[PDB]
Amino acid sequence: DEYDYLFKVVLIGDSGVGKSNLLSRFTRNEFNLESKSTIGVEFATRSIQVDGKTIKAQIWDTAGLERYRAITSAYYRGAVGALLVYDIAKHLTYENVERWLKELRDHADSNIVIMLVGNKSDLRHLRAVPTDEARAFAEKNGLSFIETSALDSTNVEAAFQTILTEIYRIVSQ
Amino acid sequence: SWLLRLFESKLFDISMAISYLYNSKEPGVQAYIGNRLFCFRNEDVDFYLPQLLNMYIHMDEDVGDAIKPYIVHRCRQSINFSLQCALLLGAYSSRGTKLRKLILSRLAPEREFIKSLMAIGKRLATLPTKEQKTQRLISELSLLNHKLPARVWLPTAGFDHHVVRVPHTQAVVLNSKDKAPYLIYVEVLECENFDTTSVPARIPENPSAVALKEPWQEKVRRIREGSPYGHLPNWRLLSVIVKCGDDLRQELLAFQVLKQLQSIWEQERVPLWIKPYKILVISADSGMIEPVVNAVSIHQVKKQSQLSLLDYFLQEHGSYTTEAFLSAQRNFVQSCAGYCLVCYLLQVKDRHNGNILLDAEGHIIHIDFGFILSSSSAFKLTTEFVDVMGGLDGDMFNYYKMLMLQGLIAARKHMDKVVQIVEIMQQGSQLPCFHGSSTIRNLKERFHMSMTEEQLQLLVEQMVDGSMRS
Ligand SMILES: Nc1nc2c(ncn2[C@@H]2O[C@H](COP(=O)(O)OP(=O)(O)OP(O)(O)=S)[C@@H](O)[C@H]2O)c(=O)[nH]1
Ligand SMILES: CC(=O)/N=c1/[nH]c(C)c(-c2ccc(Cl)c(S(=O)(=O)NCCO)c2)s1
Prior knowledge:
Domain PI3K/PI4K catalytic (chain B): 214-470
GO molecular function (chain B): 1-phosphatidylinositol 4-kinase activity; 14-3-3 protein binding; ATP binding
Catalytic activity (chain B): a 1,2-diacyl-sn-glycero-3-phospho-(1D-myo-inositol) + ATP = a 1,2-diacyl-sn-glycero-3-phospho-(1D-myo-inositol 4-phosphate) + ADP + H(+)
Bound molecules: 5'-guanosine-diphosphate-monothiophosphate, ligand 093
Family (chain B): Belongs to the PI3/PI4-kinase family. Type III PI4K subfamily.
EC number (chain B): 2.7.1.67
Shape of chain A: globular
Oligomer: heterodimer
């Protein structure tokens, strides 16, 4: 039936980090090793309750490839939240998180809630970004932080549920 | 989810892992498998080190980068492992070099030990006779003891150890050729773990020196009794053939194939017999082989005895009414069927009695695996061999055919495991065994997967009839 809120959230990050599987995990509890590059944008939705209120989240899975980065930025418009994702096992993807946040201070609301996400925590032995270094950078820049595995599903629910809650109580007064 | 399902199932073993790694173009899979390697047992993955490293060298960077972390991890926990990586990396590229240098960056004792062994062998080229070479070898090996014991080992050994002593008087050179290989005996003290122990202390030394044709246990006795270290319970004797100027990469490939066929035949329950002998690739040029002891070439068995093979069997084991004879005959029949199958499947060529060893229990052992697969006589069943088996009408001879069929049926059921080994090695390879255009395709055809068993029976007969015509 009725929601109290409709929160528009975007997923951004380098190509390959797992955005589309975070989304598929979170909205239909599905994952896949084989992948199709996200062409432009993909849409999915899921409703949750925080502090007694039904919030329907509208998630836009953007695509990290640059071919499409003119058209992803279109959808940054009026989004309340953004999951900024990097692959824990591929250092370069973490290096680009700085350029991915300037990307929000050009095409998106200047008062948006951001969570940094280290994805692929299941690849323990390939880890190229230590959890401590990341979380340090996270709050130096006023971002919330979590590590997920879309594959085994660790923290995927938590990640979304955290950012949606954080959002839901910025709005009040 | 269906793929990840499989990878998390019982069916997932290091073979499957390597296969997907080799074939999948998905970087997510590559990385997933790169990580799963850590979960497997070292011994299981070890067997595939040449494949992993070949892929690393000759394949897309994505594939290399998925493999590297695991390799580096193993390299850090075992210098033996480090060594084989560094040696293989170098041998299989002539991408590798950056990592090799990093691994070699400590190992100097071992690398100098090996360099010196190699160096020795190259010097013997100026001595035109076997016997003269042997004299210089013996002299020059004695100088190595001046540096022992040290942080040095023989990678070809079943166990962890330190090398303590070289009984130089016992070493011998095997032919009169320009780059003749030479056989040596090495003394060692066993470890439970190399990386955290010893280097034992020198014991200064002083009949045991005399060298002659004798069984392996009689030779260990003599050497042990003469040795400073011989009293210790810790003490064991090894042997390696040193090839200073011969490529051993096909020899290594054959080893893997033999080892696989052997497991295949143990798992199905076919009592064929074969003997893979260990290989250590050192360069594209050079390496070592662990020899089978209590074995001598068929050819030389006939030149020193002056007997027919059967007559020699009868001399060495007993009359055909004895147990020792009937047992040796059985080992003969089972080792022949085994090796026939190996020869056919790998298309082993250059087959003659210089290349077939006879061990003290009656097994034969084939040896020179230059000339396999695409590289271009075939395996023969001479009447001398048929005689030892008791003749064409014989039960043991019929059994030989029975075994061949059985082992073929077994092989077909596990074909992919065999083909995998060869096909990954072919990659960036300029080895003569891959010279042809249809190496793997021909290999698969030789399994005859379409055939009905009645058809295979026929193929075995044809094979055997063929083996006799010459
Ligand atoms: N091991 C592991 N692999 C993952 C995880 N998340 C995603 N992957 C794998 O990473 C690869 C790429 O993920 P993908 O879903 O395309 O992310 P993406 O950020 O949407 O990539 P793109 O849409 O911008 S082109 C896929 O093979 C996927 O299976 C994870 O948590 N663990
Ligand atoms: C007494 C004896 O011959 N022991 C051996 N055991 C083994 C495995 C031997 C062997 C195996 C393979 C090869 Cl390739 C060689 S070899 O020294 O290099 N002979 C070359 C042509 O024969 C020797 S020799």
